[PDB]
Amino acid sequence: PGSHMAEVKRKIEEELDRRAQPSDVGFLVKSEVLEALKPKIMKAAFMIRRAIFEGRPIILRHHADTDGYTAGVALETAIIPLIEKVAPDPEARWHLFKRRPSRAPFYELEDVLKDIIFMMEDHMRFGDELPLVVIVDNGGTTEDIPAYKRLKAYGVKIVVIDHHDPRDWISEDKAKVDEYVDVHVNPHHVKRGYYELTAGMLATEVARYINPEVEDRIKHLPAIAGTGDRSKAPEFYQYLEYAKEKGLDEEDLKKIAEVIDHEAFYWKFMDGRGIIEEILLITGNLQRHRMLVEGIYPEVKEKQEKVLKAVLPHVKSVVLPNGIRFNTIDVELYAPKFEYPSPGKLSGIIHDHFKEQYGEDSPILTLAYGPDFAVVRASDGMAKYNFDLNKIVKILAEKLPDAGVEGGGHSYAGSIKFFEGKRKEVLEAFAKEVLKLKA
Amino acid sequence: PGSHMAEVKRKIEEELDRRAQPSDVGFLVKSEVLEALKPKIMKAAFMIRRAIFEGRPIILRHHADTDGYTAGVALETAIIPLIEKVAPDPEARWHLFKRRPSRAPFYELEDVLKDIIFMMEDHMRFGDELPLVVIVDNGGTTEDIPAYKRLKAYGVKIVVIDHHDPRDWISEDKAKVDEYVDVHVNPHHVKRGYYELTAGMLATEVARYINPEVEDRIKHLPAIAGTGDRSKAPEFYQYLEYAKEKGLDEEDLKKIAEVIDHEAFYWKFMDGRGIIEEILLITGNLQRHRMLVEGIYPEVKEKQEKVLKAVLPHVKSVVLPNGIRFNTIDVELYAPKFEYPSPGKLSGIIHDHFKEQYGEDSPILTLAYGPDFAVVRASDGMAKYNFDLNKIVKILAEKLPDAGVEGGGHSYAGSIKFFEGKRKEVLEAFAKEVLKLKA
Amino acid sequence: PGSHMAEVKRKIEEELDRRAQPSDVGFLVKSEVLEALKPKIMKAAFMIRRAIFEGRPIILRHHADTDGYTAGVALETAIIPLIEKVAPDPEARWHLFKRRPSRAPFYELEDVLKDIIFMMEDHMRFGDELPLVVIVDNGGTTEDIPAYKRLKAYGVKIVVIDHHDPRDWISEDKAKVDEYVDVHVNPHHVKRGYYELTAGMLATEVARYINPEVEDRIKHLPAIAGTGDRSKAPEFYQYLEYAKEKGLDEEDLKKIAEVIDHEAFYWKFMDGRGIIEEILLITGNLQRHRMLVEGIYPEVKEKQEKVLKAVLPHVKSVVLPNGIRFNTIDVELYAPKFEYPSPGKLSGIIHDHFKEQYGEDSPILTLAYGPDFAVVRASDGMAKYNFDLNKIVKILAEKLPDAGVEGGGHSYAGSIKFFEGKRKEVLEAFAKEVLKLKA
Ligand SMILES: [Mn+2]
Ligand SMILES: [Mn+2]
Ligand SMILES: [Mn+2]
């Protein structure tokens, strides 16, 4: 009776463990970082494959930019075929895998609460198991913990593939966030500061372990992802060779990245299925890829040139006594609100213009502000002055405890929030900290 | 032919009337107000049970706060089992009952128009009857009439369970809104001003008449609802005993209420199914309830403390000649826009702080304003000065006919709207009315 | 084998061509413009009928105002019955036709990207062919081309039924946009400037060619559409007679139009199915139509009167030396934000008031502005001064290249956008251009 069913179940669990084990397929490039991450990469692939083979649903959340979309689509491309080979139902693909972008740089409560409500409905209504959750290009920080506390109330297992700094280290290779997730694939564990190995690179390698058969289809994705995130990693320069083999040079890759970020701005919370795959060149439909990229890119380029031409006259640029070129722009007063490009993207376009004119290695700091936020971008040259945005933000919060100062990101790129009524004081204090920097 | 079908239909209608009659199960507490409301309570339960037994769908709309969610979930908990016992289809639960929160304190046109479009699709596409509409913690005022005029164009029957003042009385126990709905359960009909018998209390009692079998599961809900709405009713202090029996003390209840209001802020238009039931302790899954409340509450507490610490230095507090402590805070300039806590919730947190420091019975008036709105909170002590927000709003509208003044709510708690360009004049006139109050 | 299937397919294509041919049913009114548009009208109907007969889905996009809704519903009313007669499945109606409003006056990227994602899902998941796309009261301009470039990457066929000026003419009867669509029905091709033959007029005639059987049901729709768009066309005054036959006088039509624009404001991205048909009087349910229009219209009228009374004292009206009456109103400072009526609608209500008081033929220019936009309305009297908004906008952009000036619309009605920080300069320059106009 129950003994028959239990003994058969126990054997099924064991055979699932065995079949889920990924092969050691190595990597597409040479990298000591990837080699050091191999055990966690193989564990991630094991967990994903096991969910697939047991008919458990998967939710894949990814950040909504080129690197994130590329990473998410890499994983989807490996997963879907496996789901289709083991499922009798042709609806299984659509039902047992969901990809959802996150516009925020962390797993927002609105996102996780939606994921929980949706998964609980499928559970109660159709008897589905609760899903494996895979978070990509997000998830590896302390800001993600609130979401994970909620998922753990449901016994949900969680895979993270990210390349942002977890920051709060509890040991040499363990961060605070790691206690709330089951496997965390992140270069920062094996080499602190190695942001340049991006989510799309990591995710493509994980995807190869999940399903070695999709290698040839996706091996160029890391070049697209690295272009999106502007990686200067030795791994990236190897990954580029796979794109070249398919006829994509470096300018092609840049156009593709710009197209993805533009289209994703407009489709918002939708996932771009039916479009993103064509842009990323993972279907055999070369003509549709060309029509999309050649149709869209000129439009994107023209918008950027138009907005730059109109906004640039309002950018104040001063060379400070220490040699720093400090640029400021009020993107509430002198930018089109709610339109492409967003303040973040606009600040990048302005910053790039100053880099093209004066050089990336010149010390350039671009501050783009609204009523209650500022986006900050620092050229590589700012490293010569030990510019660290996180340190400056902590300083500002301590000097102005009533101004609601918050944020940061990278030491060289990120954003600040503050109370609108204390903007003048916060930004003047920010400027004083920049003046005081020493070579 | 048609005579066979018609005679059988007529007998089915009569047996439906008979079976729908609820038993007189009394109440969970002693209350002359509930006793006086019994006929309408029994009518509400009759209408709901009848819809269920005829296979008619039900839409339940409720305000999106602790009292409203609690009330809605109380009713759902009684209804779903009955639907499942009479329906052959296991999809009947999901199809023939819908719970939809309303963030507005009235049945907004966007909500009712969506309800009508959705119900008309089910009608035309699947042949469903048009639903019984049950509105809870909303619906009992003149601001709800526009929605009801639209529903009545479709011959829809409407149950209202609310505890806000209908205001526009046409007789001793009948208000203007009552002409547009089929049964209105509201303590104000039998005892004017008795707001402290809240929707979750009322709805739990209605739920017991709908389905006496769920009594033990939901009899603690009124304690949660009353905590959310800060009821000081004699009924509330009895209802608390049912929560104590299940191990929930008064601090537990407060944490639960704070958790609901926090989570509901983030899930927005979603209904929280799969989560809210766990927080409200109506499943047997004690561990999940604990993980959610103990996981979430510290996070909620920390956000409130952080925001309070940052905002408090910007609150102006003056004791006026008449003894009133008048607090003002610009929540556009000195609060985080679009984040938890909302302006309404923030004003409450600031107001509570002033109450803790100076006492609830001291006369405290907290005015939190943005560009074009203000939230007003008056301590019990303000009653000694005959403070009435609705009267003050009428005065302001008459003195400043070009300023677009509108709103009110309770005599002691509510909000004003006005034209941004007349803010100074409106708020200075508001302050003069407060100065002129006499003990 | 493949020869059997291919020969049968070829014959099916030929019989589809034959059956899709519409009858020459003439028109409901006398019109040289319609006569000149007949070949394109018949082509539009051919393409729509062919899609229906082959079981291809149709997406109908329309602008979200009275004229657009009326046009969309006219076409839906003709299409649905044909779909139902040729489809075995009773779900075919719901699956093979979709009507989606567009709030923007062009085919926005957010709309088209959603259409592409949705159509690609149906394609991949259910094997549906890609749809015929029909755009109505939008689509006939250069601002629509980006959407069409994306649709053409998927080989999608596109029908446009619009009455806005394509502007960018490449020959006498061909505009730039025409290269991206398969048939464009627009009076401007055969008579430049003939905006007064509106989308609902055009669409009703197309609908008659699609399905002559629905003529009697929809022949009054053009009167509603023309009322919404305030057409003074000779065709309109004929179309009115069909409304009179059904008991709708000119005041009834105005109430209907005001009701549609009000309700559509609140249901937003939803399509109003189950409601709009009743308001438009195309069902046999006269009582529901009456309850909706008589229930809703007084509420609409009261809102307009209330807002007008409160806002009018803030309108500055000056008669300029040249005789022009120039009205200005700051609708950010002195109007209710986010509520009915929108800035566009509010400007119309203010403008109408000035027209009622001083006459339509008096030269009246109403400028309603926010932080970063302005809505402009010119009475017929402004024609005596050669007022052209598009020319003025070009002038402003050239004089103020750093102010981000954009927009236009009609020579007499439209809107400008600009950078908030250059508002003063843009509006003062706008006012100088108006001062300089000569009779
Ligand atoms: Mn990345
Ligand atoms: Mn309540
Ligand atoms: Mn139109």
UniProtKB/TrEMBL annotation, chains A, B, C:
<keyword id="KW-0862">Zinc</keyword>
<dbReference type="GO" id="GO:0004527">
    <property type="term" value="F:exonuclease activity"/>
</dbReference>
<keyword id="KW-0479">Metal-binding</keyword>
<protein>
    <submittedName>
        <fullName>Member of s1p family of ribosomal proteins</fullName>
    </submittedName>
</protein>
<keyword id="KW-0689">Ribosomal protein</keyword>
<feature type="binding site">
    <location>
        <position position="67"/>
    </location>
    <ligand>
        <name>Mn(2+)</name>
    </ligand>
</feature>
<dbReference type="GO" id="GO:0003676">
    <property type="term" value="F:nucleic acid binding"/>
</dbReference>
<dbReference type="GO" id="GO:0005840">
    <property type="term" value="C:ribosome"/>
</dbReference>
<feature type="binding site">
    <location>
        <position position="137"/>
    </location>
    <ligand>
        <name>Mn(2+)</name>
    </ligand>
</feature>
<dbReference type="GO" id="GO:0008270">
    <property type="term" value="F:zinc ion binding"/>
</dbReference>
<feature type="binding site">
    <location>
        <position position="163"/>
    </location>
    <ligand>
        <name>Mn(2+)</name>
    </ligand>
</feature>
<keyword id="KW-0863">Zinc-finger</keyword>
<dbReference type="GO" id="GO:0051082">
    <property type="term" value="F:unfolded protein binding"/>
</dbReference>
<feature type="binding site">
    <location>
        <position position="229"/>
    </location>
    <ligand>
        <name>Mn(2+)</name>
    </ligand>
</feature>
<keyword id="KW-0687">Ribonucleoprotein</keyword>
<dbReference type="GO" id="GO:0031072">
    <property type="term" value="F:heat shock protein binding"/>
</dbReference>
